[PDB]
Ligand binder design. Structure first.
Ligand SMILES: Cc1ncc(COP(=O)(O)O)c(C=O)c1O
Ligand SMILES: Cc1ncc(COP(=O)(O)O)c(C=O)c1O
Ligand SMILES: [Mn+2]
Ligand SMILES: [Mn+2]
Ligand code: NA
Ligand code: NA
Lengths: 372, 373
């Protein structure tokens, strides 16, 4: 029937890309990748960047080319397109619960070098049974609660027991701890973040010491996000960093204070067209909730003081034109910074890659919608 | 040897064995909602043109048409393509189309199907005529009027009249009437307030239609309405066509409206989620977060579990608070969640697991997912 033309062709000026589109500024992205890897290298810790941020095997390949020690995925099915692209060192930074999931994990563990988290005795036993059935081996990290109050163990006896059992069980190798504090990532001041990161590191170190004193090596302590890796890398406790959003940035992370040694550029935008100029004081954009999420608020208009993206609907954004500011014309194309990287990536099937205002390529967000 | 991802669901599966998270449709509730909306429209002798933006699913639109819907609405031109591929050829683009590639695609769509579109801008009306002329196509044009939402739409008599006169005179365009959509009244909570605001919206639309008629221009269609307002819009004597979308499904934001009148809808749309951690007394963690259901209107609700409150929502986790006295779900238990907002949740998924009496019937393709160009 009717064919849908691609939104962008290599060689197109950005202004001719069809909207809304998710756009990557390649030089900013590349600089962010280098900066995070250099930070890890400086502190002699590993970087295992989180693929949930972008769900894009081409991006993971570029991270690995710069020295990343594998990637993280949050869900077992999310790993499949990365393995298809030849990426075979993957940490599932989550617990895996459900018969189909553990069966799939067993197959993944035969095809690749996999680790997973556990925080539950029953699940550790389910994991062992599934590995044994699959003829597979997996590394196991015990997840500890360091203050987020999501998943993770919070008592010594349970950490010790899970580690002892992973050691004794066939198909399982005890590899260390996952210690991730999600809430600290967006505490605004560096002083606030540093204080909570110090406490998270102390908790993780205490569990690692408990294990060591019981004769169990605790070789990996992994965790950290884009807001905390400034501190986690220097803790002398974390051995591996799991930052994901750093390559892109968004307006929520943008609101943090970044006046220390580690800073990232905006590289990720939603391109949108002005499609109504209905009254003085406002214009309407064609990018709404279906193109960028708003659990953390609306997107921000990039490089346009005076324009304020206000109400967001399904397929419309209401932009207020502040008094004194020039209203954009009908058909004008604007760049928006999403408020939150990962859920925005998960709305799109393709990423338009730009350099010097010209389209270079379109990369496949091949793991979009893989949450099983 | 590439690793195959098994389907989440197969016909015959018990619901509890469906892999999670999955978007699930209760077929009997859905069918009841479809019938109730079509009956409401027929009772008031107005057309129903249900909005496909809600579900992006050609199978659902086919079922709406089979009950007597007069075509469908789409919000974006590219969203229409999978519906045309499924044989649907009466489509209203309930939005303005701006941008050279969009207008070119609209030209091709208008050759393949009977299309209407909205305009609120003189320059764009001229662009639309040019694009139709270039495509060799004809399209129906509705002038969008602001009836109180303050989004798009014209708000002065002179412009409504000029646009209609020009659509009549321009090649490739046929003036078909008015789009009058009040999006913000839909979730005003009391029926008393929705009714009052709907009466005023109807009066504004009627006054524009009157203006056109008095100037010798017929105004055949006045289209608008959403799930929250169609109780009142159908009975207005002004609207000729209703554009409700969410009614087939419902969600927790619409659920918070007062619904104690003659028109009510059942919950038919759920996100199925597994308990994947039981880390402390008082909470469990679900495997459905923002990547499976959106939260611009708040978190989803746990269906049928009074003492379980879905609290914090992350990317791939939901923190569920177990109320004092309530029974915490076991590890691996499967729960149904009602999304806070239908359309953006549908847009996260590629397939819809269709269930009847606890048994999987089918999986329908959400074929227009991600089509916002
Ligand atoms: C397990 C895990 N590691 C790392 C991160 C870091 O993510 P980001 O740097 O994108 O904030 C997250 C998300 O918060 C996470 O859940
Ligand atoms: C043009 C248009 N018509 C109708 C509706 C009603 O949609 P729903 O009934 O799903 O709320 C909307 C969005 O709310 C809309 O944008
Ligand atoms: Mn995030
Ligand atoms: Mn909606
Ligand atoms: Na072992
Ligand atoms: Na005409």
């Amino acid at each position: 029937g009717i064919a849908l033309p691609p939104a962008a062709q290599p060689g197109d000026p950005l202004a001719r890309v069809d909207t809304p589109s998710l756009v990557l500024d390649l030089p900013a992205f590349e600089a962010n990748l280098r900066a995070m890897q250099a930070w890890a290298d400086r502190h002699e810790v590993a970087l295992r960047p989180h693929a949930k941020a972008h769900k894009c095997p081409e991006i993971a390949l570029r991270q690995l080319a710069l020295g990343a020690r594998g990637i993280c995925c949050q869900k077992v099915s999310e790993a499949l397109p990365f393995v298809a692209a030849g990426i075979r060192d993957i940490h599932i930074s989550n617990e895996v619960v459900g018969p189909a999931k553990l069966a799939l994990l067993g197959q993944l563990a035969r095809a690749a070098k996999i680790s997973v988290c556990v925080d539950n005795a029953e699940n550790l036993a389910q994991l062992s049974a599934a590995m044994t059935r699959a003829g597979a081996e997996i590394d196991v990290l015990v997840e500890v609660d360091v203050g987020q109050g999501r998943c993770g163990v919070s008592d010594d006896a349970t950490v010790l027991a899970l580690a002892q059992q992973a050691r004794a069980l066939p198909g399982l190798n005890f590899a260390g701890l996952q210690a991730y504090h999600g809430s600290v990532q967006h505490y605004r001041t560096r002083e606030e973040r540093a204080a909570v990161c110090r406490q998270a590191a102390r908790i993780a170190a205490s569990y690692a010491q408990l294990l060591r004193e019981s004769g169990i090596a605790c070789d990996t302590i992994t965790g950290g996000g884009t807001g905390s890796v400034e501190f986690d890398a220097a803790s002398g406790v974390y051995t591996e960093l799991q930052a994901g959003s750093y390559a892109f940035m968004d307006s929520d992370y943008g609101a943090n204070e970044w006046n220390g040694p580690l800073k990232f550029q905006n590289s990720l935008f939603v391109l949108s067209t002005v499609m109504s100029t209905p009254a003085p004081g406002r214009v309407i954009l064609d990018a709404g909730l279906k193109s960028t999420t708003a659990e953390c608020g609306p997107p921000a208009v990039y490089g346009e003081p005076g324009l304020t993206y206000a109400a967001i609907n399904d397929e419309h954004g209401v932009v207020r034109v502040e008094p004194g500011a020039q209203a954009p014309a009908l058909g004008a194309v604007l760049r928006l910074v999403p408020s939150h990287v990962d859920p925005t990536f998960n709305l799109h099937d393709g990423l338009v890659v730009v350099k010097d205002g010209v389209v270079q390529d379109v990369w496949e967000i091949a793991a979009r919608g893989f949450s099983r």
